[PDB]
Design a protein around this ligand. Structure first.
Ligand SMILES: Cc1cc2nc3c(=O)[nH]c(=O)nc-3n(C[C@H](O)[C@H](O)[C@H](O)COP(=O)(O)O)c2cc1C
Ligand SMILES: Cc1cc2nc3c(=O)[nH]c(=O)nc-3n(C[C@H](O)[C@H](O)[C@H](O)COP(=O)(O)O)c2cc1C
Lengths: 216, 216
């Protein structure tokens, strides 16, 4: 029951480092990252999946200064996903996407492929050339991916925590992201919570719908 | 299982106007909106859930003329959700959130409540004063909610499509959002697809993980 999943999931504050994802689960989480929807299927993202001691430690360099409380979550979880956005939308990426759709069998005719490409270029250009908000627009798609991911990992019976509390400059530098064309946005440790996870037992809290939700 | 859901769900291109959500389903989609996570539990959002014909017509006004194909989808779906972000994170809202957390029993002591409020204020202030990205930060939380929602509604057996193809200035004006401190970001019609939904039977397409995903 997905509503049950949504109501029971929580942000894990402490992970049991001994409780790893199964091999299948580790593939499932990668599938969830890949299959998120995004505007124009633009998929403007890269993921770093850290599963080794060394790899997790590299990500954990970002939990410095104001962000030290994030460090243990990054080290102790089984798998840690760094969600990254492209820093600019380029035509090469646009072509990549449409060619992949063609390879996958989405276009019956050259005309259909060309109309798809034109539409995607129009939208991408509106953001980059006119609104000058392509970096934000791409970042929004990445956050959508995060939302899909958190629900999906809960539905697999896995714990996770989304983290904005990290130093993206440190994380980008550690992985050479800027030169590759990406920037780190959200870190999501995934695994199984320990008995020290005080948030596992605390009540969920949300604003009432009478504040947030209008029916018409 | 949730991976089946992720692999089978799609953006619906055409809705069967006769197929309405059940009352239970209409409550469930509200539950999904409310229970999404967000940075600091800041919940910087408002939802407009249009289920009457008049209501849906008000939302569909935003697509008139320039977003014709969008317009039809918003009219035909059972329930149409407008995802809105706050335009500023005011201290009233910060207090609302922490007081709600208190009401729900998340704090053992006044000290714990005060530390929570201080933390949230610090984050909000960093975005507003230093990063100059508070509107974007809130908008990102709203996109995360959308991601959660799309997977959740698919897992309920419902069809949907996320839509950026609408005129947010028009939608904002129609509902007086600017003065209320909100702006429209994404519209999500929800219901059941019709036989005209050509996308229901097309293969999904995503870039290969060898492009988008690095393991370490
Ligand atoms: C984008 C995002 C960033 C977050 N950053 C952090 C963080 O740095 N550290 C942390 O412990 N919790 C973090 N949280 C967890 C939130 O506090 C949490 O989602 C919210 O209080 C709702 O509780 P729940 O996730 O248990 O439903 C983050 C949440 C989101 C969605
Ligand atoms: C934020 C967002 C905005 C979108 N806007 C539109 C839109 O205005 N019209 C439309 O037909 N599809 C829209 N799409 C659907 C995407 O094209 C679709 O998600 C993508 O091609 C992946 O296909 P799937 O959703 O079937 O998995 C949007 C998707 C997202 C995530």
């Amino acid at each position: 029951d997905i509503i049950s999943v949504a109501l029971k999931r929580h942000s894990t504050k402490a992970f049991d480092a001994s409780k790893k994802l199964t091999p299948e689960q580790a593939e499932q989480i990668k599938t969830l990252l890949q299959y998120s929807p995004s505007s124009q299927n633009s998929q403007p993202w890269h993921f770093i999946v850290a599963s080794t001691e060394e790899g997790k430690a590299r990500v954990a360099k970002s939990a410095a200064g104001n962000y030290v409380f994030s460090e243990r979550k990054m080290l102790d979880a089984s798998h840690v996903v760094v969600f990254c956005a492209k820093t600019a939308m380029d035509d090469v990426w646009l072509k990549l996407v449409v060619d992949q759709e063609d390879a996958d069998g989405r276009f019956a005719t050259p005309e259909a492929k060309a109309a798809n490409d034109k539409g995607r270029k129009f939208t991408a250009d509106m953001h980059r050339k006119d609104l000058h908000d392509d970096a934000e627009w791409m970042a929004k798609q990445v956050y959508l991916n995060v939302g899909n991911f958190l629900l999906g990992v809960a539905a697999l019976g896995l714990d996770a925590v989304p983290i904005e509390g990290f130093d993206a400059a440190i994380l980008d530098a550690e992985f050479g992201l800027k030169e590759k064309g990406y920037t780190s946005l959200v870190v999501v440790p995934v695994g199984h919570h320990s008995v020290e996870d005080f948030n596992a037992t605390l009540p969920k809290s949300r604003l009432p719908q009478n504040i947030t939700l209008t029916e018409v």
